[PDB]
Amino acid sequence: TARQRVWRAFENPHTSTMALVFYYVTGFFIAVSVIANVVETVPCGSSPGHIKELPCGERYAVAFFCLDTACVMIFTVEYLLRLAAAPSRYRFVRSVMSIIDVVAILPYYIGLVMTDNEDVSGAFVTLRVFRVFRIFKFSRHSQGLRILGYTLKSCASELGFLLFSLTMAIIIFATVMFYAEKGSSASKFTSIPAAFWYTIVTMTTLGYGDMVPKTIAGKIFGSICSLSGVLVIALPVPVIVSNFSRIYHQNQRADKRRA
Amino acid sequence: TARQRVWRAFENPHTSTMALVFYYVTGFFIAVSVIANVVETVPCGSSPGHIKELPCGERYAVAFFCLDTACVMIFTVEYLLRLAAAPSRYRFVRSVMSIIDVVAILPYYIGLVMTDNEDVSGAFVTLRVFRVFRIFKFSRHSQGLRILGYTLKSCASELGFLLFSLTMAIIIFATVMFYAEKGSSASKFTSIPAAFWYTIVTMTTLGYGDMVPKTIAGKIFGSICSLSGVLVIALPVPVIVSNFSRIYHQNQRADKRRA
Amino acid sequence: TARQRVWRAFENPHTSTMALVFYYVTGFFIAVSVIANVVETVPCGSSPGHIKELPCGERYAVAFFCLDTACVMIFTVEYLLRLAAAPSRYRFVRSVMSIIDVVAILPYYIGLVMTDNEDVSGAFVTLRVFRVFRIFKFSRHSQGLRILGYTLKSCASELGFLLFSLTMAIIIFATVMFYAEKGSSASKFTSIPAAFWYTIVTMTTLGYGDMVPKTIAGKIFGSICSLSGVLVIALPVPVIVSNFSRIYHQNQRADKRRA
Amino acid sequence: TARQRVWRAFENPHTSTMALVFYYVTGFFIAVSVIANVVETVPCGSSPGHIKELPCGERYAVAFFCLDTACVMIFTVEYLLRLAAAPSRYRFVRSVMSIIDVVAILPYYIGLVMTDNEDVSGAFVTLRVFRVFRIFKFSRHSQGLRILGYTLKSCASELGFLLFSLTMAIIIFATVMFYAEKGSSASKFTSIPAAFWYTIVTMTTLGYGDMVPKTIAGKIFGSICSLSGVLVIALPVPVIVSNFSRIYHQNQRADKRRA
Numbered sequence A, B, C, D: 001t002a003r004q005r006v007w008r009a010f011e012n013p014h015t016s017t018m019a020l021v022f023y024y025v026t027g028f029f030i031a032v033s034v035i036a037n038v039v040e041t042v043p044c045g046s047s048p049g050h051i052k053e054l055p056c057g058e059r060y061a062v063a064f065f066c067l068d069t070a071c072v073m074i075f076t077v078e079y080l081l082r083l084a085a086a087p088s089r090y091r092f093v094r095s096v097m098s099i100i101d102v103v104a105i106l107p108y109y110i111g112l113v114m115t116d117n118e119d120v121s122g123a124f125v126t127l128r129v130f131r132v133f134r135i136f137k138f139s140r141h142s143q144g145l146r147i148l149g150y151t152l153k154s155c156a157s158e159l160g161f162l163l164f165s166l167t168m169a170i171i172i173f174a175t176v177m178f179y180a181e182k183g184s185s186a187s188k189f190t191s192i193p194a195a196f197w198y199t200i201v202t203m204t205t206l207g208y209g210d211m212v213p214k215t216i217a218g219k220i221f222g223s224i225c226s227l228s229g230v231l232v233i234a235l236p237v238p239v240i241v242s243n244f245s246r247i248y249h250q251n252q253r254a255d256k257r258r259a
Ligand SMILES: [K+]
Pocket: A207, A208, A209, B207, B208, B209, C207, C208, C209, D207, D208, D209
């Protein structure tokens, strides 16, 4: 029944002090890995023996590699233990969180096996991006009751419909703006996909201001887009508020049910 | 009983499998026409024998014309069958979906009969814009768009009042901003219609930043406009969500009446 | 009882057809006055006998003066009739709407009596601004049930508290940003009142981008300001939604009470 | 029974008219100190005998110092009486209003004892910033601030979770934007902390426009970030309004219990 004990330690950390300490140390390692990934891109000053400043990941490549490999060893042993402790190993692997784990650790090994092609580009940057997946294990650690997550799932149909309507509106407004502004001087509306950027920025009430209309027709349709954007940004608030109230009351009723 | 069978197959595609196949085929062609319209404006890049990169709709004008006319023939045939199978031709034409189909289908024929004036300026832009309403045919492919349109129809007098109040506030704030900003050096507030743009951008909380006040009075009234825009973000939500909720409740009442 | 008849015609337009036609013609004159004020600032092209283009109000000064004086005569006779028809003339004058009327018409007469000092500045622009008050008579004409107005009055305490808290937050964040950014190169945070503009723009989620932080401390506190701005723009929506629902239900219950 | 009478006069200014006078006097001095802090940074304009316009706090450093020390002596005396009249000195000091008073009152004395190092850089900025918390003493002058602070205390774990989730999303989006934008020419995404600014600006729907993506991948992920920001505008509203409504209901329950 050893698998039962280790699985109970993993899936339920507060039951045993050993489970709690393992949970806390692996959370600490997750946090240090995230911070190391963020910090290795910060340029170090004083330009030691170089024309320009180097990032922390290049000036201290060995140190950051040691930190990354320590974090990856911890994550790998933890994942293998979870795999060997799962009552249904196939079902555990089919879980989304196991997918997050595997896609978080495998970038390191892929970078290892491509050491011969050290000058790799496009795939190297993509692997370094995929290292961001380690953050998603925080929600395994900050696994507090997902009342907001449950309410977001409660509005999944509304969000899907809102995204479809947003796609329709974006295409329509982008067509209109491109044809209203294709002819301006040094125009940034060089195509309908180019106006996708303006439309998505306007309908979310960002307004960066890099692409702004310069024609009277362009400004009229940009105003229509702005009002549609006000509606877009404003709709979800009462929906989420009502759903959150309902779910919180359901959870309190379940609490008084279990008591 | 053949024409009415065809008509009910049009209304209810899920009944007959052949009707469902025709439904999915026309939906796929709608999506293809929309994507072709969006893509034909993209610059091809490194145009062969041309310094400037031509749009893909100009590099391959023959291929894009053939694809467009294929989609247009499909739409015209489908509309003609919808006209023949419809019991009341006048009322069916009066149905808003029929108007959408008509306004999406003529632009191709208008471009056809206008081939003598192939050197036009402006009108071709309007026709190519009107080609975008092929998207609205997707209303026939979703219950969400149908209920959204019903809600928008419900919020007609109320959203009209909100648009009227927004127009009032826009004129007031544009007046005060033009008069505060007309004297500035190299000012963009050259008139009150010119300040309509700044006012509508500020209320919607875009803030592109192309027109910003540069005087103390202008900045004061811009702050007032910004706060009024914060209120604008909230003004139409009660009406929209109340009408939508009423429609939702009546729909669930009908659904339980079905049971 | 003539005063009774004329007062009933004024305060209740739909009772008599004469009252309705007078109401509609004075509304038409209000609209034409508003449009004339907006249009007289639009620059006329072709620069007739001038170095630069003239606005419609200067190229056609006589025509716009005739239009303005016709509108002012109509407004003046209407206001005098209302004054002579009011059962309590002092109480009628004490009404806010009579104040709006008097402040809408008197700018014209003040401009008349200052014809000797035709080169007046600062007060002339202020009078032309005060001509915007004619728009507020639309809400006398579009006097439809102010459910939104009643709900806004229902939240008057909440809005007052929100403005006080907004003033506190603006002063605090402006102090912090000015002291974080007083030393940057060519800094636009030249004073705490200068940073009032940045703070009010950031806390409303405009982000024009003319004043942006350039220091690490400035960016940190700008991020705190941005989050506070998200809260500011987001709070009023559920409040107004609930109040609107409550007031609409109260009004429907009053309707079924009167029936 | 004199000390406790003084203490209850401090707690309940409306009881004794002399207590109310002292209350309004200290509130007026708080407002005066706040306005003096704000105004002393304004450039005086056309400095006599100086090319650069000095701030009013430097043109009249003696007058502003005298006004500041008057306000500080009033605050120090008022705090000393609050300390003497308080029954439990330790607990009263532990009360948050006492901490606010202390942190607002020391900066003047810290500047006093530091007069030897009158040539400091940076520390004086921190002290002058800490002078802004004289505003928070207005919490003693409003029930709205008190209930707002109680609500913020209630939304402690939940708003902590929201800040944690915002940090997670900010790190993820900053990573993807830095890696999409690091290769651009003259890019402002020089690191992941550098892209923290763009990410937090985009989620809050500011869009200053100083940092904008200039690559197709960057624009795609910026659009995703913009939509996530639209969701951010709605995420904390349910918690805030639910806790505030619970506090409001309990307050009305207590008020009717008073009746
Ligand atoms: K901007």
